């Protein structure tokens, strides 16, 4: 039942990740973002509905929080400048192995 994509792998029980077989510790809400990414693999992610579903509807903050969180996901697993977590201008992000 563990959910896998390319070189990232997730166990739904104890909330940890393997990146290319290496276990990695990560923040809870950041982990929820990654859970959204894997649960909708191959489908583009936009900041709004990301805010709608993952985050509480009471969120009164700015929009830089999600961009920063994506930056953390990059520096944790996809350290390369080109990364499996591609970003779309005005349309958000997507988890996809580059062609």
């Amino acid at each position: 039942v563990r959910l896998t994509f390319a070189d990232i792998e997730l166990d739904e029980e104890t909330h940890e990740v393997w990146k290319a077989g290496q276990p990695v510790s990560l923040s809870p809400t950041e982990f929820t973002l990654l859970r959204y990414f894997v649960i909708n693999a191959g489908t583009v992610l936009s900041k709004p509905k990301i805010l709608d579903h993952v985050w509480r509807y009471d969120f009164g903050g700015d929009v830089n929080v999600v961009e920063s969180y994506v930056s953390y996901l990059r520096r944790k697993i996809d350290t390369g400048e080109k990364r499996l977590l591609h970003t779309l201008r005005g349309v958000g992000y997507v988890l996809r192995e580059p062609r």
Binding site: G42, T43, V44, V91, V94
Partner: protein, 49 residues
């Protein structure tokens, strides 16, 4: 008379076609899949994976 109904004297085979296409979209891609939300199983019996 009911003989025509019973003996299939006047009966016609009628065939219809139903096109449906999954196309690219800014939201991503539309999948021809069984991952259909909020559906029962007696109506899922006659579908392949």
């Amino acid at each position: 008379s009911n003989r025509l109904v019973e003996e299939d004297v006047l009966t016609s085979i009628h065939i219809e076609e139903h096109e449906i296409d999954a196309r690219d979209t800014k939201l991503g891609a539309e999948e021809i899949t069984r991952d259909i939300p909020n559906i029962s199983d007696e109506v899922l019996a006659d579908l392949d994976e």
